[PDB]
Design an enzyme around this catalytic site. Structure first.
Site, mmCIF file in Angstrom:
data_model
loop_
_atom_site.group_PDB
_atom_site.id
_atom_site.type_symbol
_atom_site.label_atom_id
_atom_site.label_comp_id
_atom_site.label_asym_id
_atom_site.label_seq_id
_atom_site.Cartn_x
_atom_site.Cartn_y
_atom_site.Cartn_z
ATOM 1 C CG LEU A 1 -1.696 28.622 -41.334
ATOM 2 C CD1 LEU A 1 -2.663 29.707 -41.702
ATOM 3 C CD2 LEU A 1 -2.236 27.809 -40.186
ATOM 4 C CB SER B 1 4.771 26.271 -48.553
ATOM 5 O OG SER B 1 5.567 27.281 -49.149
ATOM 6 C CB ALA C 1 2.823 27.377 -57.356
ATOM 7 C CB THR D 1 4.614 30.562 -47.868
ATOM 8 O OG1 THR D 1 4.386 29.956 -46.591
ATOM 9 C CG2 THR D 1 5.547 31.771 -47.743
ATOM 10 C CG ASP E 1 -10.670 26.951 -58.623
ATOM 11 O OD1 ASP E 1 -11.064 25.783 -58.817
ATOM 12 O OD2 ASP E 1 -9.546 27.220 -58.152
HETATM 13 C C1 LIG Z 1 -4.040 29.816 -52.389
HETATM 14 O O1 LIG Z 1 -3.885 30.926 -51.482
HETATM 15 C C2 LIG Z 1 -4.937 31.223 -50.539
HETATM 16 C C3 LIG Z 1 -6.229 31.798 -51.157
HETATM 17 C C4 LIG Z 1 -7.129 32.295 -50.020
HETATM 18 N N1 LIG Z 1 -7.344 31.320 -48.903
HETATM 19 C C5 LIG Z 1 -7.892 31.919 -47.764
HETATM 20 N N2 LIG Z 1 -8.839 32.858 -47.879
HETATM 21 C C6 LIG Z 1 -9.372 33.454 -46.821
HETATM 22 C C7 LIG Z 1 -8.953 33.092 -45.555
HETATM 23 C C8 LIG Z 1 -7.961 32.110 -45.437
HETATM 24 N N3 LIG Z 1 -7.553 31.749 -44.155
HETATM 25 C C9 LIG Z 1 -7.028 30.518 -43.751
HETATM 26 C C10 LIG Z 1 -6.487 29.603 -44.662
HETATM 27 C C11 LIG Z 1 -5.965 28.401 -44.190
HETATM 28 C C12 LIG Z 1 -5.968 28.174 -42.789
HETATM 29 C C13 LIG Z 1 -6.510 29.154 -41.939
HETATM 30 N N4 LIG Z 1 -7.019 30.270 -42.438
HETATM 31 N N5 LIG Z 1 -5.397 26.956 -42.590
HETATM 32 C C14 LIG Z 1 -5.053 26.444 -43.736
HETATM 33 N N6 LIG Z 1 -5.381 27.288 -44.763
HETATM 34 C C15 LIG Z 1 -5.122 27.086 -46.203
HETATM 35 C C16 LIG Z 1 -3.941 27.970 -46.662
HETATM 36 C C17 LIG Z 1 -2.699 27.130 -46.291
HETATM 37 C C18 LIG Z 1 -3.137 25.703 -46.715
HETATM 38 C C19 LIG Z 1 -4.677 25.653 -46.548
HETATM 39 N N7 LIG Z 1 -7.459 31.560 -46.548
HETATM 40 C C20 LIG Z 1 -6.207 30.454 -48.485
HETATM 41 C C21 LIG Z 1 -5.241 30.040 -49.597
#
Ligand SMILES: COC1CCN(c2nccc(Nc3cc4c(cn3)ncn4C3CCCC3)n2)CC1
Length: 300
Positions: free
Chosen positions: A22, A24, A26, A29, A139
């Site tokens: 979904l 990547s 720092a 991933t 944040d």
């Molecule tokens: C920086 O690291 C993490 C921190 C937590 N955060 C998160 N917390 C709960 C559920 C979830 N689920 C999720 C995330 C999604 C997604 C679908 N479900 N589609 C895209 N993303 C984010 C992560 C990849 C880029 C955007 N994500 C996503 C990024």
């Protein structure tokens, strides 16, 4: 104070499958995946965040996990469990429509006032819960609000929860002070981000200048769709005296009142004729959809 009786779940690598990536960065991933617990006869859409193995970075993700396992609110992203591999990975709920910031940019043409005001109510609710759980987010931004369904958003990213300059209160920039009322300031900025359909706050202005600009009395402009009523709320979030800023429980009330008559508070051309996907759509929900339940309905 009160003992944190939260359960940290350890999940077998074999209990779940990584489908695709979904995003990547720092950190490591994030993967789209499926979790099939024991013999439960359920498939749960998940987001798997994995980290090179450096002992300091593991401490940081295990801190994020501590906080994420400590929440339980319909407008906050809970941690479903951790998997102790060579890397270490957080298992979270899949938020199919990704971050709200990209959602507003990619869908402005179909985003009406009802959605915008309802999102505001939803974030104020999630934030008010964090306040109940004596938790300071540190944040808040439209990037750290994820979309489950266009009608249901949740606050996430507890990596800082105990620097993003253009989202921070004055006290936070100059004295490193973070309060619940400092989260209110970032709430004001998040609202601005949504009302402008994903604009970059203080575009062009370098982070170093921000501190002085705010000290002078300068604030983010009035978005074209905003009535004085809505901007007047955003401005109260950006007061120098943090105790003057609104409380999240008031912000819930204010946006809720406004969400009962969205056209009176946000002027968007085409409003009401616009439409976004709903669980009442054809093929709204790739392999076997046979026993797929959403995490919000799976509770051991
Ligand atoms: C920086 O690291 C993490 C921190 C937590 N955060 C998160 N917390 C709960 C559920 C979830 N689920 C999720 C995330 C999604 C997604 C679908 N479900 N589609 C895209 N993303 C984010 C992560 C990849 C880029 C955007 N994500 C996503 C990024």
């Amino acid at each position: 104070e009160a003992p944190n009786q939260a359960l940290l779940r350890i999940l077998k690598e074999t209990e779940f499958k990584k489908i695709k990536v979904l995003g990547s960065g720092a950190f490591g991933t994030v993967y789209k995946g499926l979790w099939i617990p024991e013999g439960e006869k359920v498939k749960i859409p998940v987001a798997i965040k994995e980290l090179a193995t450096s002992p300091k970075a593991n401490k940081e993700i295990l801190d994020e996990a501590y906080v994420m396992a400590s929440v339980d609110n319909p407008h906050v992203c809970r941690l479903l469990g951790i998997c102790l591999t060579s890397t270490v990975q957080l298992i979270m709920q899949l938020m199919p429509f990704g971050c709200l910031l990209d959602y507003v940019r990619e869908h402005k043409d179909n985003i009406g006032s009802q959605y915008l005001l309802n999102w505001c109510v939803q974030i104020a609710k999630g934030m008010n819960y964090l306040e109940d759980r004596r938790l300071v987010h540190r944040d808040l931004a439209a990037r750290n609000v994820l979309v489950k369904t266009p009608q249901h958003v949740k606050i996430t990213d507890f990596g800082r929860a105990k620097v993003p300059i253009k989202w921070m209160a004055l006290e936070s920039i100059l004295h490193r002070i973070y309060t619940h009322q400092s989260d209110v300031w970032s709430y004001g900025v998040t609202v601005w981000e949504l009302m402008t359909f994903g604009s970059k706050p203080y575009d062009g202005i370098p982070a170093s200048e921000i501190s002085s600009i705010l000290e002078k009395g300068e604030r983010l402009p009035q978005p074209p769709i905003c009535t004085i009523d809505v901007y007047m709320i955003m401005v109260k979030c950006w007061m120098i005296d943090a105790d003057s800023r609104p409380k999240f429980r008031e912000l819930i009330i204010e946006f809720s009142k406004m969400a009962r008559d969205p056209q009176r508070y946000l002027v968007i051309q085409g409003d009401e004729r616009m439409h976004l996907p709903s669980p009442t759509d054809s093929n709204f929900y790739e392999e076997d959809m046979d026993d797929v339940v959403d995490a919000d309905e799976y509770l051991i």
